[PDB]
Design a binder for this molecule. Sequence first.
Ligand SMILES: CCCOc1ccn2c(C(C)=O)cc(-c3ccccc3S(C)(=O)=O)c2c1
Length: 105
Amino acid sequence: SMHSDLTFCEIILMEMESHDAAWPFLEPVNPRLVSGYRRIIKNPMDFSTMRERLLRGGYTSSEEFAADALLVFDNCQTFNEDDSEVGKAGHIMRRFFESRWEEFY
Ligand SMILES: CCCOc1ccn2c(C(C)=O)cc(-c3ccccc3S(C)(=O)=O)c2c1
């Protein structure tokens, strides 16, 4: 149901926000600080933007919430080197997200 779907999304968002590897993903990247960011990343996303969407009602399905999560990780992979701490955190978070999503559904 919509209620059960959004309940699970709230759980997994909290689990992601509180994860050891969440530290790069808690706010938007600031393109005034990271000058070239919005030339490379055309669709920014982060956990705080997901929280705002969820708490309002902007998601109508669990899959829409999940698509934003995957976009966070895709953006991280596009912008950051795989050997960087941020890049490694993105890979960890993707694996965590996919495992929680799959074990549930
Ligand atoms: C001042 C230049 C900062 O450069 C970057 C470039 C990219 N990122 C990312 C991602 C996901 O691409 C994340 C950060 C980051 C890292 C640690 C703390 C805070 C941040 S952030 C989300 O406030 O930019 C971060 C910082």
